[PDB]
Amino acid sequence: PTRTVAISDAAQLPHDYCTTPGGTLFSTTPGGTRIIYDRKFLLDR
User: Out of 16, 19, 27, 29, which residue is the most buried by the measure of CB atoms under 10 Å away?
Assistant: First the structure.
């Protein structure tokens, strides 16, 4: 499954996330859910 999560603060920024060359954040949990992050905190992505 795909989950959309917005990040508007460093508090909301995960500590185990990954980032693709395009500059998109993502993380997958043990459950199998794939979370795609929209990093609004950082403007200079």
Answer: 27
Residue written as tokens 């990954």?
18
- Go through 15-38 and write b for each residue having 16 or more CB atoms within 10 A of its CB, e for each that does not: eeeeeeeeeebbbeeeeeeebebe
Question: Are 7 and 38 in contact, with CB atoms under 8 Å apart?
Answer: yes
What residue type is assigned to position 7 of the chain?
I
CA 34/CA 28 separation, integer angstroms = 4
Method: NMR
